[PDB]
Structures are given as C-alpha cells and as structure tokens.
C-alpha cells in the first residue's frame, strides 16, 4: 500500500493482540504510544522512569503485544500508555517492522 | 496545532 | 530519492533562505519547528496566541525552502528553545510530495 503525506493526519489502523487501534504515523518517535483511555484495562502495565524528551514517567505494556495489519503482516511491539493524549502514536519501532519507505516522485 | 518527537 | 523508516532518526538536510538546516522528518507534526539555538538572530520572530498541544515564537517572514534537487517552496516555522533536533512537519513534507510506501 501507499499513503501521500498531506496536511491531513497520516493514519494506520491495525490490531494489537485481539483489539483494533487507529493511530497517527509518528516518524519523530522511536517508540509507540497508546492513549490510556484506549488501553484494555485487563492488560498489564509497568510504571517506568523512561525519559520521552511527552512525559518522563510513562506506563508501559508489561508484555510484548502482537501487532497485525490488514494484510496479515505481524510482529511484536511494547508500547507506552499515556493519559491526556488525543491520538495513538505509531513510532518507528512499529513502522520499521512494517518495512515502510518514504519515497518522492 | 498538534506536535506529536522523543528519544 | 528513497529513505527506509528504521530505528535510526529519519533526517533531511535542506536550505531555509540560503542557510543549511538538518532535521528529523516528523510526520506527527502539522507545523515545522526550528531550534531557537539554530535560529539566525537577525531573522525576526514574533509572539503568537497559537498553542502547540506551549505559546511559541514564529518566523515573522515566510522562508523559502530548497532541497538538494532544487525543489522549493515556502514555510513559516515555529522557533522553540530546549529541543534536541529541528522537526520537519507535514507543512514542509506535503510540499515535497513525499509518499509512504510498503513493499
């Protein structure tokens, strides 16, 4: 597949374990972030002091999650989980496993 | 606007 | 040209009004941000009522961007202290006609 970069938010929909998430392609970040309101409450988290040059105390998934796209490509990511965030943010941890290129005409 | 970077 | 997305920082080097800047490709940002520490002090910046979700300074003038293939256009970046890297937002990336592609 192919997606132009425009002033529109560049978005991707995929599954993490059984659940569907939509988020913004975020090439500026090496890690993925899930909005806490979208986090399934039974999924375990670990508090961290990881400095995200966002917040410096994010929660993180305890477990690796299996990501899957609509073409059934898959792999593992371990996202941070942050409140007060308007959109999920797909970072280069995930984008690198989907073999995404940036291309110019 | 919205600005989503961090190391 | 082509640039894979990897764990490495995806970077672009270009000119803004004939000074060279290097920055991170930032698809999550609507607007471009230049480090105040990199900002030529003679280039005027102005206060804004704009919030970034911060009340930041902005280039008073439109800048002409140019890439190494001599493509060009205009941007008016925000200018913010205490950032690690310049951030190329979709304002600039949309004008360079950039695709994201999967094999």
């Amino acid at each position: 597949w192919v997606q132009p970069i425009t002033c529109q938010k560049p978005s991707l929909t995929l599954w993490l374990d059984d659940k569907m998430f939509t988020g913004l392609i975020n090439t500026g970040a090496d890690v993925t972030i899930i909005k806490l309101e979208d986090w399934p409450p039974n999924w375990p988290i670990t508090d961290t002091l990881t400095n995200l040059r966002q917040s410096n105390n994010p929660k993180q998934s305890s477990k690796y999650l299996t990501w899957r796209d609509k073409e059934n490509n898959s792999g593992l990511i371990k996202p941070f989980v942050i409140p007060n965030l308007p959109v999920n943010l797909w970072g280069r941890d995930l984008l690198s496993q989907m073999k995404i290129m940036m291309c110019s005409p | 606007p919205y600005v989503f970077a961090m190391t």
Side-chain angles (χ1 to χ4, degrees), chain A residues 1-52 54-105, chain B:
Chain A
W1 60 252
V2 162
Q3 206 188 118
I5 300 169
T6 74
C7 289
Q8 301 265 44
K9 292 251 198 308
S11 78
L12 224 49
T13 300
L14 55 107
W15 292 258
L16 305 174
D17 293 348
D18 58 315
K19 300 289 174 36
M20 181 174 287
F21 299 78
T22 300
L24 170 69
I25 297 171
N26 188 39
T27 59
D30 44 24
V31 297
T32 288
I33 308 166
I34 302 302
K35 67 188 185 162
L36 191 155
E37 63 178 318
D38 284 2
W39 185 260
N42 38 320
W43 289 11
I45 62 91
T46 301
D47 295 297
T48 85
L49 287 176
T50 303
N51 194 328
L52 303 176
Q54 312 276 333
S55 57
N56 48 339
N57 60 312
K59 300 171 181 289
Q60 188 169 28
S61 184
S62 295
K63 290 202 174 98
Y64 284 87
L65 311 173
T66 297
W67 62 265
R68 190 175 308 275
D69 72 13
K70 288 181 158 274
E71 299 194 40
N72 202 44
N73 303 305
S74 58
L76 285 182
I77 55 154
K78 190 183 251 196
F80 296 84
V81 186
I82 298 188
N84 291 328
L85 180 91
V87 292
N88 300 310
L89 297 167
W90 304 132
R92 298 201 307 281
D93 60 341
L94 177 65
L95 303 167
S96 64
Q97 292 187 47
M98 309 178 168
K99 293 184 265 176
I100 295 161
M101 321 305 304
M102 286 170 305
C103 325
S104 206
Chain B
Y2 276 128
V3 181
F4 289 129
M6 69 197 70
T7 309

